[PDB]
Nucleic acid binder design. Structure first.
Lengths: 185, 141, 83, 221
RNA sequence: CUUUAAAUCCUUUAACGAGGAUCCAUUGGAGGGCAAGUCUGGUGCCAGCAGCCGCGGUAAUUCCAGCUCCAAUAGCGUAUAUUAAAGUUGCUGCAGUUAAAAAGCUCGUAGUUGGAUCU
């Protein structure tokens, strides 16, 4: 008898056919323009999208004008519009069935950094997110797989302790200045 | 099914249990004689002692004599054949040493050209054959 | 077909048989689109217009297109009523 | 280089008086002239070869190896075809197969799943095809689900244009010809299944020879 | 410095700390199934590979070594059970002329299933 949680779940899933051409080509493509580390991240994204589409499937299985269906649907569309994968005008119950992986991957933090113009490349955006240079509503964020809400989108800025947006220079510029003043005299 | 009455369940359950009894894999997996005839006793691996080195012949057109080991397992005590898997690995084993044996992977049946042999050799002298073949670890004296 | 807005969305609608009320597919090459001309009431001359029917393949293959077009003419009134 | 029509359908198409092959599908005329499809279905027509399976008959003068060519054809908007050609060397087999697939193209009807909203995406009902010992089920699926089947009927259902479907297979599916023809007359059966929407009493327009019978008898010999 | 019975763990912060960021990423594979060289050299039914077809007899797309390439990635492979694929246990939803198959036939008690009609 211990005070333990013992709760966990798999986040990704493996496909049935390992060796193939087509789905390999689209996942290698989306890693190409979206800058992902490995196949496990898009496997997690596909599993999450499969879960939400399955939940939408038994939600739409139940009949119209049912209380729990209406409540669960209103909460689900409110979550989907507050994360920003939908838009505020198109609130319909069956349009959850018509979205794909790029809508899930659009609200990634790397895509927001790359499209906000404070990064050169998506690889540069990934290495700069991993190096803790961004404050989001005055909070230092490190994780690249970060979901940005719609209301928390205009507060993306460089962290105040980073040398890029204003602050102390790091180890390397201090080393170059020290060796320059050492070699000057 | 064919017996399609509304109150027909016991006859259908009896027919289903007798027909599932009339099978091969279920009778293999739900009888004690099949597991009793297994020299592993339902275990994945076993430990035994090398007692001789045997070079057995091959089948039709594939013709290459294969070198196998008769191993007596410690836990039950019967002479069980085992095949040295990889090239250059028979010189790594000697007489009266302990060998961790396992099957080839086709559920206790003969695999490939080698006749009558269903077990292979994984570990000898508490070191893997892969480490001795690659040269990562040396065979202790 | 229609939709929620209600406009036409199918590419076409197939014609139906006048005897069995069954549609004619694209690869049913035994169907017939033959025309029946009508006569003038006063003289019996050709007035110029026509009216047609449609039969499916399987009725011809089983062998009853003739009495089917006979009852179609009976409902039309082109053939005599006493027959 | 210039095309010379021999069939009166080809003359009617070349005389700029047949607007589409859609009315030809409506009136179900046979096609034995394989460039009306080239005239109407232009650069959107897509080609993909299935598998080349050699056949032979045992003789006294040695084993001769005739080749069978398997192919699928069709744009991403409906019409889809299949063609089997038997010849000796590969190139004339491939050319004859794509020609005979261009002969036998059928259009398909796209339906909905649950709600009739937006553009149609799936099959309207459950249709099947029967040849040899192959049973191929066509069950409608919701939006964006994807085709779950063997790889060859995934390829066939993207050639047909059905993005979302549910399938089932039975029998010896190793033979590609019987299975492919079973899928083909399964997806060609999406018309011949009467729905309550088609309950309106049809009206027959003029036969395609009847509008321009004078033009065809003065420009066709 | 914090935490803690007191430390260690995490976080914050000094001073340091990378140009083959040597601060050096493995696992089984490359004929088909099943994404990846008719590359080169050696033995040539022997050594071996191979879950299955099959690769070895002196021109090895499979053996043994070097190069390149593909798969997942701090993870990968093997053996035992087990599930789905198995519509190969079929209640949904298997078959019984010829692929395994209907008692030689008939009667017959439990069990199974039983015509229409009442506003």
């Amino acid at each position: 008898p211990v005070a333990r949680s013992w709760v966990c779940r798999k986040t990704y899933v493996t496909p049935r056919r390992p060796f193939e051409k087509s789905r390999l080509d689209q996942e290698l493509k989306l890693i190409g323009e979206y800058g992902l580390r490995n196949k496990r991240e898009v496997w997690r994204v596909k599993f999450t999208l499969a879960k939400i589409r399955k939940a939408a499937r038994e939600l739409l299985t139940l009949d119209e004008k049912d209380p729990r269906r209406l409540f669960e649907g209103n909460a689900l569309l409110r979550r989907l519009v507050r994360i920003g994968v939908l838009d505020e005008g198109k609130m319909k119950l069956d349009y959850i069935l018509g979205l794909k992986i790029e809508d899930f991957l659009e609200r990634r933090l790397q895509t927001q950094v790359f499209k906000l113009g404070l990064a050169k490349s998506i690889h540069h955006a990934r290495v700069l997110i991993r190096q803790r240079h961004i404050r989001v509503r005055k909070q230092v964020v490190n994780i690249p797989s970060f979901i940005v809400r719609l209301d928390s989108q205009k507060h993306i800025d460089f962290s105040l302790r980073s040398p890029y947006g204003g602050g102390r220079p790091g180890r390397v510029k201090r080393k170059n200045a020290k060796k320059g003043q050492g070699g000057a005299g | 099914g064919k017996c399609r009455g509304l109150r027909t369940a016991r006859k259908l359950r009896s027919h289903r249990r007798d027909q599932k009894w009339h099978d091969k894999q279920y009778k293999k997996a739900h009888l004690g004689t099949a597991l009793k005839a297994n020299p592993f006793g339902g275990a994945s691996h076993a430990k035994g002692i090398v007692l001789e080195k045997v070079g057995v012949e091959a089948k039709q057109p594939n013709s290459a004599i294969r070198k196998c080991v008769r191993v007596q397992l410690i836990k039950n005590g019967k002479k069980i054949t085992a095949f040295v898997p990889n090239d250059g690995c028979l010189n790594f084993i000697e007489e009266n040493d302990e060998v961790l044996v396992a099957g080839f992977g086709r559920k206790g049946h003969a695999v490939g050209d080698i006749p009558g042999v269903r077990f292979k050799v994984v570990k000898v002298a508490n070191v893997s054959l892969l480490a001795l073949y690659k040269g990562k670890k040396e065979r202790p004296r | 077909m229609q939709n929620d807005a209600g406009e036409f969305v199918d590419l076409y609608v197939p014609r139906k048989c006048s005897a069995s009320n069954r549609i004619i597919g694209a690869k049913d090459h035994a169907s017939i689109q033959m025309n029946v001309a009508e006569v003038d009431k006063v003289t019996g001359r050709f007035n110029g217009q026509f009216k047609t029917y449609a039969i499916c393949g399987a009725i011809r293959r089983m062998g009853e297109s003739d009495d089917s077009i006979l009852r179609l003419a009976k409902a039309d009134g082109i053939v005599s009523k006493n027959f | 280089k210039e095309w010379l029509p021999v069939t009166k359908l080809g003359r009617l198409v070349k005389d700029m008086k047949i607007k589409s092959l859609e009315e030809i599908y409506l009136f179900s005329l046979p096609i034995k002239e394989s460039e009306i499809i080239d005239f109407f279905l232009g650069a959107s027509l897509k080609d993909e070869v299935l598998k080349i399976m050699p056949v032979q008959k045992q003789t006294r003068a040695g084993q001769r190896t005739r080749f069978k060519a398997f192919v699928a054809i069709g744009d991403y908007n409906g019409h889809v075809g299949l063609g089997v050609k038997c010849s000796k060397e590969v190139a004339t087999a491939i050319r004859g197969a794509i020609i005979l697939a261009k002969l036998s193209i059928v259009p398909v009807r796209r339906g909905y799943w649950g709600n009739k909203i937006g553009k149609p995406h799936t099959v309207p009902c459950k249709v099947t095809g029967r040849c040899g010992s192959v049973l191929v089920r066509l069950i409608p699926a919701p939006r964006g689900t994807g085709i779950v089947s063997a790889p060859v009927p995934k390829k066939l259902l993207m050639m047909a244009g059905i993005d979302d479907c549910y399938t089932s297979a039975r029998g010896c599916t190793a033979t590609l010809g019987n299975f492919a023809k079973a899928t083909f007359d399964a997806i060609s059966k999406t018309y011949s299944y009467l729905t309550p929407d088609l309950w309106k009493e049809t009206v027959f327009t003029k036969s395609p020879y009847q509008e321009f019978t004078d033009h065809l008898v003065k420009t066709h010999t």
